[PDB]
Amino acid sequence: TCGLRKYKEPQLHSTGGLFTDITSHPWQAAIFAQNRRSSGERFLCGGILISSCWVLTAAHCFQESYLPDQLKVVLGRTYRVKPGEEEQTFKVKKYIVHKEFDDDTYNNDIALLQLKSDSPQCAQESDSVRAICLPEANLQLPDWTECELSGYGKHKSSSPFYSEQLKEGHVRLYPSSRCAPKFLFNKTVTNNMLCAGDTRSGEIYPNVHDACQGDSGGPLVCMNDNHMTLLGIISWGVGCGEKDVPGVYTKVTNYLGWIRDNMHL
Ligand SMILES: *C[C@@](*)(O)[C@H](CCCNC(N)=[NH2+])NC(=O)CNC(=O)[C@@H](N)CCC(=O)O
Numbered sequence: 001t002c003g004l005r006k007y008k009e010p011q012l013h014s015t016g017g018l019f020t021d022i023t024s025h026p027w028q029a030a031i032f033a034q035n036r037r038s039s040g041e042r043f044l045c046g047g048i049l050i051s052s053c054w055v056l057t058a059a060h061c062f063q064e065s066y067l068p069d070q071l072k073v074v075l076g077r078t079y080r081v082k083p084g085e086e087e088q089t090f091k092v093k094k095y096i097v098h099k100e101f102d103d104d105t106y107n108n109d110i111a112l113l114q115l116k117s118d119s120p121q122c123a124q125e126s127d128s129v130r131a132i133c134l135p136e137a138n139l140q141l142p143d144w145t146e147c148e149l150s151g152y153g154k155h156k157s158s159s160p161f162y163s164e165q166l167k168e169g170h171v172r173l174y175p176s177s178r179c180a181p182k183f184l185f186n187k188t189v190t191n192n193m194l195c196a197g198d199t200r201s202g203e204i205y206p207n208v209h210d211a212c213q214g215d216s217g218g219p220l221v222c223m224n225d226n227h228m229t230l231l232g233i234i235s236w237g238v239g240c241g242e243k244d245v246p247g248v249y250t251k252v253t254n255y256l257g258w259i260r261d262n263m264h265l
Contacts, residue, residue, distance in 0.1 A: 001125070003133040003227030010168045015155055016205030020168040022078045024241040025150040026130035027219060027230070028166065029055050030080065031113070033074045035064065041072070043162050044156060046151040046218035047113065048230060049075060049131050052124035053090075054263055055113040057217030058235055058250065059101035062111065068092040073113060076128035078166050080152035086128040096262045098255075105188040108252050109235040111217075112262055132230040137253050139224065139231075143175035147196060147222035147231060150249075153214025156207065157240040162214040169197045169209035173222070173231075174246045184248065185238045192254045194232045196220055197246030207241030219248050 004027055010018035022028065029047030034040075045061035055073060071092040077084030093116030098108040115122040123129055149169040153162055179195035181187055189195075198208035211218060211234045220232035232249030239245060 002131045003229060004130065005228065006127055011235065015207060016203070017155065017209060018168040020150075022084065022166055024127050024168060025166065025219070026076075026128055027132035027221070027228075028075070028150050030074045030077060030133060031057060031061065031217065032074070032154060033064070034070045034072070036070065039157055042239070043080060043152065043214060045214065045216045046153065046234070047073060047204050048217070048219045048233065049129070050134060050230070050259070052125075053115040053117065055115065056233055057113060058109045058233055058260070059097045059111045060103065060106065060109055060235075061217050062095070062097055065207060068094055068116075071095065071113070073115065075123060076126065078165055080166075084128065086126055087135050088123055088129050090117060090122055092116065098258065101253050105190065106236045106248070107190045110233055110255050110258070111182055112259065114193065132219060133227050134256065134259075135224070135229050135231065135253050137256050139229065139253060141173060141222055141224060143172050143173055144199075145222055147171055147173060147220055149196075149211050149215070149218060149220050149234065151211055151215030151218035151234065153216075153218075154212040154240065157212060166255055169198070171198045171209055171220070171247070179246065179248075183245070187238055189248065192251050193235065194249045194251045195246035196232065196249055197244075198241070201243045208243050210241040211235045212237075212240035
């Protein structure tokens with residue numbers, strides 16, 4: 001029953017963006033770290049629940065080499081920092097950062113998190129917690145297809161604050177011809193990357209829907225065969241919501257092999 005969700009209508013707001021209930025994105029996860037000693041818990045990234053005890057994310061979310069006990073993963077929370085009514089918190093048993101992750105070019109920006117629970121069933125499905133469907137390796141959706149993204153990250157590139165509530169963004173798959181350095185300010189684009197951005201330009205709002213800092217590891221889901229299918233993991237981008245500049249994402253179909261292995265099967 002992956003890819004299902006009781007979609008509720010997002011509240012639009014000031015920036016022209018959207019705020020939404022966790023029910024519309026049950027696969028979304030919030031990862032926190034605790035560098036030890038004491039003194040707070042910092043928001044690290046977002047994550048995607050692919051199965052009851054596994055979570056996908058961006059390799060670059062792990063700058064400071066953390067230890068499993070430090071990392072905490074909460075699911076089923078709408079507000080980044082308030083405790084959710086049906087939230088579910090777990091702890092990392094072990095996390096895997098893609099061996100060939102290039103900090104310089106964000107290539108292979110992908111990492112797994114094995115949860116830890118006293119039962120072979122960690123996350124318990126509910127209207128607020130539910131896995132996303134992994135695409136088959138043959139899945140290549142048509143250019144310009146409409147997808148979605150979610151996260152609790154920043155709203156504008158230059159903002160010291162992360163979002164206080166779950167964001168919902170609407171973007172479209174850019175064609176390959178438009179996903180090159182020439183468009184991404186001469187920045188490097190690889191075969192493991194995929195561009196997606198909001199094409200609704202001009203309108204009142206200066207910024208278009210897009211993921212920003214703090215969203216990394218979050219999903220880029222597109223409906224396929226009546227089920228939300230995971231298509232990319234929020235990796236990088238030059239700025240945030242700049243009109244006509246697509247966001248770069250990790251091409252999940254390139255990593256089904258890597259996942260299948262590092263994930264116990
Ligand atoms: C780590 C992760 O949360 C962020 C997500 C930003 C997503 N951006 C877009 N447009 N969807 N990932 C990174 O920050 C990876 N590094 C970068 O994106 C740098 N290019 C940041 C430079 C800048 O802020 O302009």
